[PDB]
Design a protein around this ligand. Structure first.
Ligand SMILES: CC(=O)O[C@H]1C[C@@]2(C)[C@@H](C[C@@H](O)[C@H]3[C@@]4(C)CC[C@@H](O)[C@@H](C)[C@@H]4CC[C@@]32C)/C1=C(\CCC=C(C)C)C(=O)O
Ligand SMILES: CC(=O)O[C@H]1C[C@@]2(C)[C@@H](C[C@@H](O)[C@H]3[C@@]4(C)CC[C@@H](O)[C@@H](C)[C@@H]4CC[C@@]32C)/C1=C(\CCC=C(C)C)C(=O)O
Ligand SMILES: CC(=O)O[C@H]1C[C@@]2(C)[C@@H](C[C@@H](O)[C@H]3[C@@]4(C)CC[C@@H](O)[C@@H](C)[C@@H]4CC[C@@]32C)/C1=C(\CCC=C(C)C)C(=O)O
Ligand SMILES: CCCCCCCCCCCCO[C@@H]1O[C@H](CO)[C@@H](O[C@H]2O[C@H](CO)[C@@H](O)[C@H](O)[C@H]2O)[C@H](O)[C@H]1O
Ligand SMILES: CCCCCCCCCCCCO[C@@H]1O[C@H](CO)[C@@H](O[C@H]2O[C@H](CO)[C@@H](O)[C@H](O)[C@H]2O)[C@H](O)[C@H]1O
Ligand SMILES: CCCCCCCCCCCCCCCCCC
Ligand SMILES: CCCCCCCCCC
Lengths: 1020, 96
């Protein structure tokens, strides 16, 4: 085939132009984001029940919906929370590979049929269903600095004038408002209600009657009295639009014609739907939007358009209203794309320098400059053809792929110039010569390298999704580089290289290159002499080979092993937890001192503190909170002591002296869709209707046994909230019936005054908003306020709650978890230092076996995933080596010669093993794929050397040691050229020994490869 | 039920429209709100788009506004189906 395109250089140009046009169109059409979708599809059902405790939520909503989640396909597990905020969430997690559209429609369709089974208040509130496994592109914060707008005002403005514009923006997929818009709040007064013999039932009845829309009909509608001239709609009532009109709602006409209006027994003002969250941004009132990138979109274009539209809106923007961007993922996208172009142009500069230093002509330095960008552009086409996006994983894969594409380029040009200098052939006849020498090895290298990278793409779940990005990027760039090296570079050498006289090695030219040429020739003969000597004492170097492979196994096992470490992202969280019964004000004081710490003692690192009151990591409530701390870029806080790893520990130790609170700073994960991957996620399950307290006791027994094993388990804790005092109030049914009081009036008065009640909607400047009734705060704080509410009896007399109720304190759970339909408790932990998380998990299974009867367990989250990927590892690694061996045996026509190459490649890997040792790197997926790339690259060196060795023995009938020496002589310059390009490339990143490790990664190959070729063919 | 076109728009059409964002292959969106109290929101998709997946995605995005819609409407039923705009034929029936 290369013969074909050398006689047809313009056909090959046509093919390279097609590849460039496809790659350009691919870059224009290609989606771009930080990470691809790795998390398995998760659909979350959310509902609200105002005034409700955790078990009313569970006993009327959660269990009912969970019982109707049948018939849905491809479900892995379902978990759900019911807390004392009236909030329930049910997350159904599906198998990786299942259509998230079909998954969500099936879930909501079952929920729809279950809706008539829910309480009438829950149906009124409405039930939402979202895809929860997608994460935010950025978070636009909207804060007020002049101290004139409350958070309710900011969020109302953002919904009215910002949100829908942001959603209509191109690329935006979903926008979530971090707050509630205005709501017509009715703050009743029990003393005024009692003064007029009124209850909240009357207030609600009047509101439903006077703030209603009423559909009459038509004036002169069909069927008419024919003769009729006019047809017109009849409109009776419509909604209200003002607080003033709500104040004039007539509740009662006194019998002397006097009016009792709603304003006379309640305060009326625009407020929030919800008052349990308090969001601040550096101590200022705050709100914002969480924006999600749409499907097939460009995060760079979308973020620009978002800041563009936010940039515009100033002709409408109120006083003190500022936009801030506490969280944004597109900087990391831009960094990973920039490092691809930085590596590409630095690659062509260095290969230009090295090609010229060895070959002393400019026309040879053009063939790599053309060939490399062609295949880099083709990779984008192949990525687009298969549905992949430009992300940090594929861009990492392209950066690693560049090193192999330049070696493919250098090998082909160098061998044709060696054939011209050794044999004195014209460029055309000599290029036929040279690819006839290397074409089979080139194809075999393609098979070998996909045998390395392809099999790891077949992990399941999250692990496979990450490996797929590297695999297709590297295998694509490798396969097209081979196709280009058999099509494009043959024609370019045959068409562009000058002839060379036989024997002209440039020893006779002058200046610097004359000195270099015979310096290199002298070293070339030194090298062949030394390898010739090594081939007499091969037992000695076989022993040295094993001395160094146990040395590599040692420093490899010693490295920290973490699949996806939580690197410094520029944002971290700090969790806040106060005791049972703690009020919102007490939480705010703690958060106030938390931001005061961050903005003073970490002045030079912290840029923003986004404090959230009422919402915790492990569970919501008045005694929970979390602060999102965003830091300045990596430049303006140099040194490792100013990274998140040390800031969090300084923050945690400083926060240990906080009285009456439990504060903890920690790093958010690299892939927030997954959450850590550090440790395990554990589910304790009531399998036999045991009850809450029994399950709590078992969890305590499990936690105690875990703490007794610090050599294996670290920080084993529940991911939930502990039981708290609650106010139990009993209605005497007999006393109620004897006084003529209905139970519905009693419960409606209690739940409306104290819990609040959603009545109906109204229209505020053309936007539909809700109407809530509730008591004033001062009349619904403490138990003695219960006796200030009166209820009307059938005889008209007003009775107070004290006459027919009794109260006591008891304990109950503010948060009830469920797993797969049964009551559960989520436990978190990680393995002790040095130990694997697999051992920690099997210790937990042991300790769980002796829990009380009727208590099961299960693994959820990414512990489910690691169980999956761990059972796949050995077969995948086994198939990789099996097919590698098979293709090499196909290349060399030998069941034995593959062992020569397979046994030498773990030597190039240790040029990076010590670099991780001196810098302090971690063994992760990024380091592992990098190890494979080095293994493949060094595997290309030995494959060519052994190919030339065998060809010389088979074609020319040369001796074994003669052919081996001739082979390593013909291959020394290209190996040192490629390695020289690499060492000069990483030198600007510089600790001298890291470069000195790469050099012996090369010197080990050039000596040991001939050793293994001779040792293997002797023994077989 | 019977509401004027202004109420229907402010309490149903706008709510459904504000959540019809970011859907695959959506070209444009038209809607009318009638004196009868009825809404039709027609979402039009790029040619070649699978219509059944399109209907699926519309129902999934409609769920985000399903809670916010009024009392009467959420229970009375919200149809979401593929649609045509033209008549293929008119079959007529007379009595002779
Ligand atoms: C000057 C230079 O070094 O390269 C510049 C030039 C640059 C390579 C740009 C990255 C990206 O726009 C590039 C694209 C793919 C964008 C438009 C496409 O049609 C390509 C034909 C075009 C090639 C050049 C260009 C315009 C650069 C960047 C990166 C800035 C953008 C990101 C996402 C990191 C850079 O400044 O490094
Ligand atoms: C010209 C050339 O080929 O060097 C390129 C190629 C380069 C040496 C890269 C630095 C680094 O990734 C390199 C390592 C050592 C990283 C992982 C290792 O296991 C090696 C298998 C790998 C070899 C090639 C690679 C990918 C280069 C750089 C440095 C810029 C890269 C980053 C991430 C800032 C360059 O020159 O710009
Ligand atoms: C994790 C992984 O990738 O397996 C790697 C790791 C791998 C099993 C290697 C095949 C072979 O050398 C392996 C042996 C047993 C080779 C003999 C000894 O020296 C061992 C100390 C060495 C340990 C692992 C190693 C180095 C791999 C291959 C096949 C590589 C073959 C070619 C031609 C590149 C692979 O990439 O699949
Ligand atoms: C579904 C099947 C997938 C199998 C993949 C397995 C990988 C196989 C890699 C094989 C790569 C090419 O394999 C190789 O092709 C070249 C083509 O000149 C042959 O070449 C052989 O004959 C020609 C002339 O007749 C000589 O110039 C050449 O030096 C000699 O080795 C080799 O005999 C063969 O081993
Ligand atoms: C030329 C380029 C190279 C071509 C490379 C082709 C790669 C082909 C990859 C096939 C992927 C399937 O790999 C398949 O994984 C499953 C796990 O789910 C393995 O099954 C394994 O895991 C199960 C759990 O499921 C374990 O209980 C058990 O130890 C084992 O049987 C199968 O034995 C294996 O066949
Ligand atoms: C061989 C080089 C390959 C480079 C690939 C770059 C891919 C980027 C494609 C999207 C470009 C988006 C531009 C963002 C504009 C920001 C305006 C401030
Ligand atoms: C023997 C001639 C082969 C020609 C192949 C042309 C198509 C190459 C596409 C990559």
């Amino acid at each position: 085939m290369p013969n074909f395109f050398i006689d047809r250089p313009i056909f090959a140009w046509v093919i390279a132009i097609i590849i460039m046009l496809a790659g350009g169109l691919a870059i224009l059409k290609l989606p771009v984001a930080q990470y691809p979708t790795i998390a398995p599809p998760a659909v979350t059902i959310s509902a609200s029940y105002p005034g409700a405790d955790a078990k009313t939520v569970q006993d009327t909503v959660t269990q009912v919906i969970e019982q109707n989640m049948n018939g849905i396909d491809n479900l892995m597990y379902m978990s759900s929370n019911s807390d004392s905020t009236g909030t329930v969430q049910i997350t159904l997690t599906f198998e990786s590979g299942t259509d998230a559209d079909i998954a969500q429609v099936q879930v909501q369709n079952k929920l729809q049929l279950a809706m008539p089974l829910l309480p009438q208040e829950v149906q009124q509130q409405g039930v939402s269903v979202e895809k929860s496994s997608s994460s935010f592109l950025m978070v636009v914060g909207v804060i007020n600095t002049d101290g004139t707008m409350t958070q309710e005002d900011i969020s109302d403005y953002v919904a009215a004038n910002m949100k829908d514009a942001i959603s209509r923006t191109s690329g935006v997929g979903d926008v979530q408002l971090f707050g509630s818009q205005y709501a017509m709040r009715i703050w009743m007064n029990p003393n005024e209600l009692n003064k007029f013999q009124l209850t909240p039932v009357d207030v609600i009845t009047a509101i439903k009657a006077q703030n209603a829309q009423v559909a009459a009909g038509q004036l002169g509608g069909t069927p008419p009295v024919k003769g009729q001239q006019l047809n017109a709609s009849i409109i009776a009532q419509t909604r209200l639009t003002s607080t003033e009109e709500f104040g004039k709602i007539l509740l009662k006409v006194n019998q002397d014609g006097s009016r009792v209006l709603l304003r006379d027994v309640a305060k009326i003002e625009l407020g929030g739907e919800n008052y349990d969250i308090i969001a601040e941004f550096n101590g200022q009132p705050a709100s914002g939007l969480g924006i999600k990138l749409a499907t097939g979109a460009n995060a760079l274009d979308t973020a620009a358009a978002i800041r563009a539209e936010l940039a515009k809106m100033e002709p409408f923007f109120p006083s003190g209203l500022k936009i801030v961007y506490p969280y944004d993922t597109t900087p990391f996208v831009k960094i990973s794309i920039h490092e691809v172009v930085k590596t590409l142009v630095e690659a062509i500069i260095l290969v230009f320098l090295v090609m010229y230093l060895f070959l002393q002509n400019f026309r040879a330095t053009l063939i790599p400059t053309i060939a490399v960008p062609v295949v880099l552009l083709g990779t984008f086409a192949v990525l687009a053809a298969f549905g992949f996006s430009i992300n940090t994983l594929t861009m990492f894969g392209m950066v690693l792929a560049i090193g192999l594409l330049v070696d493919d380029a250098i090998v082909v040009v160098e061998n044709v110039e060696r054939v011209m200098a050794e044999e004195g052939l014209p460029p055309k006849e000599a290029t036929r010569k040279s690819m006839g020498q290397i074409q089979g090895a080139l194809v075999g290298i393609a098979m070998v390298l996909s045998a390395v990278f392809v099999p790891m793409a077949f992990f399941g779940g999250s692990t496979g999704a990450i490996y797929r990005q590297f695999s297709i990027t590297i295998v694509s760039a490798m396969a097209l580089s081979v196709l280009v090296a058999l099509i494009l570079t043959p024609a370019l050498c045959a068409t562009m290289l000058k002839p060379i006289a036989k024997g002209d090695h440039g020893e006779g030219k002058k200046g610097f290159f004359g000195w270099f040429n015979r310096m290199f020739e002298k070293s070339t003969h030194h090298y062949t002499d030394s390898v010739g000597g090594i081939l007499r004492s091969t037992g000695r170097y076989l022993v040295l080979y094993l001395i160094i492979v146990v040395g590599m196994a040692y420093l490899f096992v010693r490295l920290p092993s973490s699949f996806l470490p939580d690197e410094d992202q520029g944002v971290f969280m700090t969790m806040v937890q106060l005791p049972a019964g703690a009020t919102q004000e007490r939480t705010q004081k703690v958060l106030n001192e938390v931001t005061h710490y961050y903005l003073t003692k970490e002045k030079n690192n912290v840029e923003s503190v986004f404090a959230v009151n009422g919402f915790g990591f492990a569970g919501r409530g008045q005694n929970t909170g979390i602060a999102f701390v965003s830091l300045k870029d990596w430049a303006d806080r140099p040194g490792e002591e100013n990274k998140v790893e040390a800031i969090t520990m300084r923050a945690t130790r400083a926060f240990s002296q906080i009285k009456d609170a439990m504060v903890f700073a920690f790093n958010l994960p690299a892939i927030v869709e997954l959450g850590t991957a550090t440790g395990f996620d554990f589910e304790l399950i009531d399998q036999a209707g045991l009850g809450h307290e029994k399950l709590t006791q078992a969890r305590n027994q499990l936690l105690a046994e875990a703490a007794k094993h610090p050599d294996m388990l670290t920080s084993v804790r529940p991911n939930g909230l502990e039981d708290t005092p609650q106010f139990k109030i009993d209605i005497d049914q007999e006393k109620a019936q004897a006084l003529g009081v209905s139970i519905n009036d009693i419960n409606t008065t209690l739940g409306a005054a104290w819990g609040g009640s959603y009545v109906n909607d109204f229209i505020d400047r053309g936007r539909v908003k809700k109407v809530y009734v509730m008591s004033e705060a001062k009349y619904r704080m403490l138990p003695d306020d219960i006796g200030d509410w009166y209820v009307r009896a059938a005889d008209g007399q007003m009775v107070p709650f004290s006459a027919f109720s009794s109260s006591r304190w008891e304990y109950g759970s503010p948060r009830l978890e469920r797993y797969n339909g049964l009551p559960s408790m989520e436990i978190l932990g990680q393995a002790a230092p040095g130990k694997s998380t697999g051992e920690a998990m099997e210790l937990m299974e042991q300790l769980a076996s002796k829990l009380p009867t009727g208590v099961g367990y299960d693994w959820t989250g990414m512990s489910y995933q690691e169980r999956l990927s761990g059972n796949q590892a050995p077969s995948l690694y086994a198939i990789s080596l099996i097919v590698v061996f098979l293709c090499l045996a196909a290349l060399y026509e030998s069941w034995s010669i593959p062992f020569s190459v397979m046994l030498v490649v773990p030597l190039g890997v240790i040029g990076a093993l010590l670099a991780a040792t001196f810098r302090g790197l971690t063994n992760d997926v990024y380091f592992q794929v990098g190890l494979l790339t080095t293994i493949g690259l060094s595997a290309k060196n030995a494959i060519l050397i052994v190919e030339f060795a065998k060809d010389l023995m088979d074609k020319e009938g040369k001796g074994l040691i003669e052919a081996t020496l001739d082979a390593v002589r013909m291959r020394l310059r290209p190996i040192l050229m490629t390695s020289l390009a690499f060492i000069l490339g990483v030198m600007p990143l510089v600790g001298t020994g890291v470069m000195g490790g790469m050099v012996t990664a090369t010197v080990l190959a050039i000596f040991f490869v001939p050793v293994f070729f001779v040792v293997v063919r002797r023994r077989f």
